[PDB]
Structure formats: C-alpha cells, structure tokens
C-alpha cells in the first residue's frame, strides 16, 4: 500500500491521519471545549432564529469581521518591507513593462513593413 501523499488541493483523509487515533485525555478535553463554543454560539443563534416577534436579519459578527478584515483592516496592518516591496514591484510594474515591449516591438515591426510596402493590405479599408 503506497502511502497517501497529501497536497494543497488533495487533503489527507481523517481515517489515515494518525492524530485521529491514539487520543489522549488532553485531546478529548480540547474537543469538549470546542464543542462548547459551538453549542454556546448555536444557542445564541437559535434564541433569535426561533423568536416569533423577530422580523429581519440576524446580524452575524463573524461575517462582519470577515468582510472588514478583507477590506478596511488591510492597510493599517501593511508594512513596506522586502517581501511587500518585491511583490509589489513584481506584480505591479512587472506585467506593465512586459506588455509594453511586446506591443511596442510588434507595432514597430508592422510599421517598418508598411513603409517599405511589404505588408499586405490589399482589402484593408476598415480600421
């Protein structure tokens, strides 16, 4: 049996993960308090979801944090360093300089051919 080689896009099945087995009283304690947080959040939701007089949207702070974390909170936590500057230079200036030489070179060739009469434009009258 060749062993399972996990990848980023092909995760490891739990039935083959050693952490799943050989459980300790310390792991069973972590699971108990994980289940507690889920149970406490469920009760808070249900008390509102089942309220007969509620009409509206049950505001979810976890959703609000997520949309805020992926917008307004990014710049305050930005630091110009070697990683960000190199990445910013690569993905910001990099592609623009690349496409410039691609199009400039292609268009310079075409203009040269048109001047000499070596570019076929027999029926080209729409542009």
């Amino acid at each position: 049996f060749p062993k399972y080689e996990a990848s980023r896009l092909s995760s490891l099945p739990t039935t083959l993960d050693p952490a799943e087995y050989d459980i300790s009283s310390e792991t069973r304690k972590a699971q108990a308090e994980r289940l507690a947080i889920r149970s406490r959040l469920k009760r808070e939701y249900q008390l509102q979801y089942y309220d007969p007089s509620r009409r509206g949207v049950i505001e979810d702070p976890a959703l609000v944090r997520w949309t805020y974390a992926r917008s307004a909170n990014i710049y305050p936590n930005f630091r110009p360093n070697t990683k960000t500057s190199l990445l910013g230079a690569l993905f910001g200036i990099g592609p623009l300089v690349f496409w410039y030489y691609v199009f400039k070179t292609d268009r310079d060739r075409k203009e040269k051919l048109i001047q000499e009469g070596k570019l076929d434009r027999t029926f080209n009258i729409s542009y």
Partner: protein, 459 residues
C-alpha cells in the same frame, strides 16, 4: 440649448412650490417631460454638427450623452424616494435640488462649444456630487470618500486649466469649431510631453484610469443610490467625452504618449475583472466592473480610429444604462437586508422571482451578450484594437472570459442556491422597484433595433 436649460431650471421652483406630499410626483412627472423633448436633439446631419449659438452645439457624440443624462434624472428620483421618506421636508427638497443642479451642469457641459466653458461646468459637477455623497450617504466612510473624490479630480483638473489657457494664448481660441480648422501638429519636446499630460490626466482620473481609480470604489460605494446612479452612468463619461474632444489637438504626439496608458488599461481591465471575482461587497463588485469596462473606452479613445470611436461611444451609453441598473438592483436588496455583503442573502430567485429576471437581464448585458449594444460597443473596440496590434486579442479575449465569470458569479451567489434561513423580511418587489428596473433595461434593449443613434460622430 435654452429649451432644455430653462425647463431644467424650472424644476427647482416646481419642487420648492409643490405640496409637501407631491414633491416626488411633480418632479418625476416633469423631469420625464424634459426627457421626452430631448429627442429633438437627434436632428443630426452627416457633415455638420448642430450649432445653436456661440455658446452651445450638439453633435452625434454629445446628443446620446445628453439624452442619457436627462433620462437618468427621473430614474434617480424614483430610486431615492424610499430611503428619504423619513427625511425632513426641506432637506428632501434640497436633495432634489442637488440632482436638478447636477443635470443642469451636465447638459451644459456636454454642449458647451468652448473648452474653458466646458472646464468650468466639468468642474461645477463636483459640488452637487460631493454634497450628495457626504450629506446623504449612510456610513462613516462617506466623509473620506468625498475627500478622495474631490482631490483626485482636482489634482488632475488644475493642470488642465493651465494647459487650456496656454492653448488659448497660443492658438487664440478655445472654441471647438475653430480648433477643428486651426489645429496644428504637436512636435516632440519635453514641453509638449507635459502639455499632453495636462490635457489628458484630468480626463483619465474621471474614467478612471487603472492606477488612478482608487477614488471610485470608495465613492461609488458610500454614495446614496441616486449618487451612484449618476456617478456610474454619466460622470464617468465626462472623462471619456473630454478625451474624445481634446485628442483632436494632440496629434501626432498621441502616437507614443498613449503607450503607458494603453498598457495600464489593457492590463488594468484584466486586473479589475479579476478583483470582481473575490469581492465581498455587492456594490464594490459593481464599481470594479465599471473600471474594467471603462478601460476599453480609454484604449479605444487613444488608438484613435473610426471603428474605435464608434465602439467607445456605444460602450459609454451601454455601460451607463447597465451599471446604473445594477446599482439599483443591489439597492433593492440593501433596502431589505440593510447590508452590502453579497453572500449575506442568497437564493433570492426563490423569494423574488420577477426581480430575479431583472438580475439576469442586467447580468447578460454586462457580459456583453450579442446583439446588445454592450456587445456592439465592446466588439467594435476589439476589432479596432486587433488592427492596432493582433496580440491584443489575447488580453481582450481573457477579459471577456473573466467578465462572464464574475457577472454570473454575482447572479448565482445572490439569486440561486438556498435562501438564508434567518432573513425573513424579504417583502415582495414593489411596483416602483419593478418599474425602475424596466426603465433601464427596456430602453437599453430597444436601442439594439436602431443602434446608429448611439455610435457617435464617425458613423
């Protein structure tokens, strides 16, 4: 143009002298009548523009933009009157006044025959727009959005003012008809490189150009619905309209000055289309869609061919009706769930069937389904860019793939799937909301039958 300026002004006394319960009925009814008479501007000739006086003229470029502007004012009123219902009566009248005053500056801006008169009106639109965003926006960030909107525009506009006055000193006139006959070529020099930049940077910021677009996601998101409708539909087109006019006096220098800005646009649209795939805010997604579409307009204006000018004109009109409709569609959801988060309310086609049809039609026009005028414009621009350089088909093609993905991603995420269980206040769509949607899409689809009236002067 006095037959449109004067009645547009008369909307202000009409609103202020109306009964307290008829301000929306009266202003909406009479702004529609003004919209009707704007069709008289389509007396266009093959050779000559329609030149009314020493101050105002109309041509096939300004005419469709004028008709779009006067049509939008009625639609902005219907879109606004729900969320302003609790507003104080006098503050409601002031809000309508800002919209009317914005229309007045727009219809004069698109028809001013002299470029310095265009500049003053081009700039005068900042004031009502800024007031609308900051006074009647909902969030704390509306104050910052107004500052970005104001100073991004002015940072480019002030150099334009100096350039225009310099052009008048040296040429002797800024009248656009005169500039058609007295134009001289621009020869290479560092002095002319900066004249070119000062003539184009104000218009690029308004489009916006990729790199200078940061003001738009903020402003288009923080504004009230009416503010977003005019910002996307018309105000972005002041940049495109300005470029289309001033590039007359910039040749042949546009040959090489366009390269940095064509690169920013060709790559910018792919960058801003990709952004839309990972946007969590529905209004923000729509705003970034406008940047992607207006990148094509920038490229079409810069390469300066008969097909690209026709395509640019069609795109500006088509985008105006589509982007405005999408903001209105997203607003209807927001007026129900009071949140702009896209993933919050799902499966809405199950709860709001007819409004899901509008979502589909708006999405199809956005991804440029033929023969919509969105496709007509987008196709004409691609045809002319291919001739400019064949390799551009790769970037245009990729953008067309990405645009379909985010257009249908927004449709699928909000309208399909399972409804969110805890959201129980999705009331049925009002008549006002259904009519507001159909007043965007119906004119947009009708224009397919007669597309020549939105293809501009080079048709």
């Amino acid at each position: 143009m006095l037959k449109y300026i004067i009645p547009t002004i008369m909307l202000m006394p009409l609103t202020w002298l109306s009964k307290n319960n008829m301000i929306w009925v009266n202003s909406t009814a009479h702004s529609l009548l003004i919209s009707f008479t704007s069709l008289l501007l389509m007396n266009q000739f093959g050779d000559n523009s329609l030149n009314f006086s020493l101050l105002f003229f109309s041509d096939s470029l300004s005419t469709p933009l004028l008709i779009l502007t006067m049509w939008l004012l009625p639609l902005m009123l219907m879109a606004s009157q729900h969320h302003l219902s609790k507003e104080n009566l006098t503050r409601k009248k002031l809000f309508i006044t800002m919209l009317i005053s914005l229309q007045l500056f727009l219809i004069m801006t698109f028809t001013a025959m002299e470029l310095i008169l265009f500049y003053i009106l081009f700039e005068a639109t900042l004031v009502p727009t800024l007031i609308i965003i900051t006074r009647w926006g909902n969030q704390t960030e509306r104050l910052n959005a107004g500052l970005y909107f104001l100073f991004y525009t002015l940072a480019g506009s002030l150099p334009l003012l100096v350039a225009l006055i310099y052009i008048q000193n040296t040429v002797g006139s800024l009248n656009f008809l005169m500039l058609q006959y007295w134009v001289q070529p621009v020869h290479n020099s560092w002095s002319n490189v900066f004249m070119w930049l000062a003539c184009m940077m104000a218009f690029m910021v308004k489009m916006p150009l990729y790199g200078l677009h940061l003001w738009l996601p903020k402003a288009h998101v923080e504004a009230p619905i009416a503010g977003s409708m005019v910002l996307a539909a018309v105000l972005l087109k002041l940049g495109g309209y300005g470029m289309l006019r001033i590039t007359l006096i910039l040749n042949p220098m546009t040959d090489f000055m366009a390269y940095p800005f064509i690169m920013l646009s060709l790559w910018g649209m792919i960058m801003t289309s990709s952004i839309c795939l990972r946007q969590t805010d529905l209004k923000s997604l729509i705003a970034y869609s406008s940047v992607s579409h207006m990148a094509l307009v920038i490229v079409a204006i810069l390469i300066q061919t008969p097909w690209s000018y026709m395509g640019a004109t069609a795109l500006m009109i088509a985008h105006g009706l589509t982007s405005s409709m999408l903001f209105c569609l997203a607003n209807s959801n927001y007026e129900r769930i009071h949140s702009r988060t896209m993933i919050l309310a799902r499966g809405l086609q199950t709860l709001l069937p007819l409004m899901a049809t509008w979502w589909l039609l708006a999405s199809l026009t956005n991804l440029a389904l033929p023969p919509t005028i969105n496709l007509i414009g987008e196709l004409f621009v691609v045809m002319s860019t291919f001739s400019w350089s064949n390799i551009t088909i790769i970037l245009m093609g990729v953008n067309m793939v990405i645009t379909a993905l985010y257009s249908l991603y927004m449709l699928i995420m909000t309208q399909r799937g399972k409804y969110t269980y805890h959201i129980n206040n999705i009331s049925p769509s009002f008549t006002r909301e259904n009519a507001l949607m159909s007043l965007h899409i119906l004119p947009l689809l009708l224009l397919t039958l007669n597309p020549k009236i939105i293809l501009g002067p080079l048709y």
